[PDB]
Structure formats: C-alpha cells, structure tokens
Paper text:
To verify this interaction, we also determined the crystal structure of the isolated RNase H domain of MoMLV RT in complex with eRF1-C at a resolution of 2.8 Å. As the RNase H/eRF1-C interface is identical with that observed in the MoMLV RT/eRF1 complex, subsequent analysis concerning the RT–eRF1 interaction only refers to the RNase H/eRF1-C structure. The interaction of the RNase H domain of MoMLV RT with eRF1-C buries a total solvent accessible surface area of 1173 Å2. The RNase H domain mainly uses its helix α2 to interact with eRF1-C through predominantly hydrophobic contacts. Residues Phe588, Ala589, Ile593 and the methylene group of Arg585 in helix α2 of the RNase H domain form a hydrophobic patch that interacts with the hydrophobic residues of eRF1-C, including Phe291 and Ile294 in helix α8, Tyr301 and Phe303 in the loop region connecting α8-α9 and Phe406 in loop α11-β11 (numbering as previously described). In addition to these predominant hydrophobic interactions, Arg585 of the RNase H domain forms a salt bridge with Asp307 of eRF1-C, Gln559 of RNase H is hydrogen bonded to Asp297 of eRF1-C, and Asp511 of RNase H forms hydrogen bonds with the carbonyl groups of Lys404 and Gly407 in helix α11 of eRF1-C. Mutation of Ile294, Tyr301 or Phe406 of eRF1-C to alanine disrupted its interaction with RNase H. Likewise, single mutations in the isolated RNase H domain (R585A, F588A and A589K) of MoMLV RT abolished its binding to eRF1-C. Mutation of Arg585 to Ala would abolish its salt bridge interaction with Asp307, while substitution of Ala589 by a lysine would place a charged residue inside the hydrophobic interface, thereby destabilizing the RNase H/eRF1-C interaction. WT RNase H binds to eRF1 with an equilibrium dissociation constant (Kd) of ∼4.18 μM. The RNase H mutant F588A showed ∼10-fold reduced binding to eRF1, whereas the binding of R585A or A589K to eRF1 was abrogated. These data indicate that helix α2 of the RNase H domain in MoMLV RT harbouring these residues is critical for the RT–eRF1 interaction.
Residue numbers in the entry:
A (entry chain A): 507 to 530, 534 to 596, 610 to 636, 642 to 666
B (entry chain B): 281 to 347, 367 to 420
Amino acid sequence: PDLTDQPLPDADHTWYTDGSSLLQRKAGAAVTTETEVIWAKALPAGTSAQRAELIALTQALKMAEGKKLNVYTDSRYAFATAHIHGEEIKNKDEILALLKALFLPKRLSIIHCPHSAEARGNRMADQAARKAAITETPD
Amino acid sequence: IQEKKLIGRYFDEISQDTGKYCFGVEDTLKALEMGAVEILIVYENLDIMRYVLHCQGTEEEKILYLTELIESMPLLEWFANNYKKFGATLEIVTDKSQEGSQFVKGFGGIGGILRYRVDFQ
C-alpha cells in the first residue's frame, strides 16, 4: 500500500518483465534492464501467457528485495492484478506468490507499458523471453 | 455513495479474470472507439489535457494527450461532452474513498468496464 503506477524518482533499478507463450506451444519468462538480461527461464509444458507474465513479475519482485524498484510489464492482467492487492479464483498459485513478493522491495512502482528507454527495455525483455522459450527445452 | 459499488465491480472484472476492463488513456480510448466500453470511469480531478495541434506545412490536424495550437481542453471535459457518441455511460469519481483512491493511485484515474474482451495486443 505504498504502490504507485508511475515511476519513483529515486530508484536503484528500472526493470522490464515479459512472459510470452509461443506459436509453432512454448513459454518463456524474463527480467531485464534497458540493455541487459538479468534473469530468464523457459517455463513448464505450454503454460499460458498470463501465468508467464506473473511469474516474470513475481521474480522481478523477489530479486529486488530491499531495493527501490521501478518495474514495467506489458501485461494488463499482471499489472491490474498486482494493483488490486486488497482482497475459485484463476492462477491462485501465481497470485499468492506475487502478493507476498510485493512486500520484499523497499520501494515499488509497477508501471504499465505498451527508441525511448521504456520501448527498448520492453523490447529487450520480450526478446529474451521469446528466446529462452524457443532455443530451450523446459526443465 | 455507490462510487464503491462501481469501482468494486470494476475491480471484480480484474480479480475474476474476465478481461472486461481497461485502464489508462490509450487502452480506454482504443476501447471506446471499438464500441466496447459499457461504463467509462473517470477521476474528477483528472489532470490530462487534450491538445488539438496543427501540422506544420499541411492543413492537417493531429490530437495529443499530455500531462501551433488550435484548441486545448481537459480530457475529462472532453469526455463529459463526447462520451455518448461511443455509448458508453460515464461515471466520474473521487479518491476520498478507498476504492476510488486505488483507482487513481494504481489505475491512473481512467478506465472502463467493458462489454466484451478486447486484446490490446
């Protein structure tokens, strides 16, 4: 309940998450900066894009324990869900995970994104997610 | 009074994973033009301005939302006057409630309940 949708001015990290589910059905998740991949995994057998997106976000939050984080998702679902903390339900597994992860950072901004930093960072994250998915066989 | 019933309803579309919601200026506009917004929820002190701008050499016209000039107006006022053309009922709200506060702090003070699921690809 310190959680804003617009950037913190004083942030140590500005991270960009993605989690595609691919055509061909393959699933990657990733966390990056504007220019460098931090964390990337392929996900269990053909899992949904919503589950990958949340995983990628829960994981950004985990790794930002005690830091000041701006993080960008492209997922309306992952952004919306995270912002309505204050509450049969689908992706329960991944949502509880996300709900506890929220409390780890010292400052948190979870921002939505559709050659500026935002465009490049989102791009970077989708590349790495869509590349840990294709060129990699799950666990 | 029932600010909280509507935003609660809005939040439930998220929480129930319906996909029948939108937020922010771009998704909401885009959704409005597909005939997809049933209720349009807007923060009463919404800060966004709608600028109508001229394109240099041309006698053409370009609109712009921000936070040579032809006409300027608050998007809220623009919504109030023009929302019925997407139909689309309109609910202006405030942040003096907890539901309304989260809407503004977390969803940018602008969003909608949707008739059907939209992509935003």
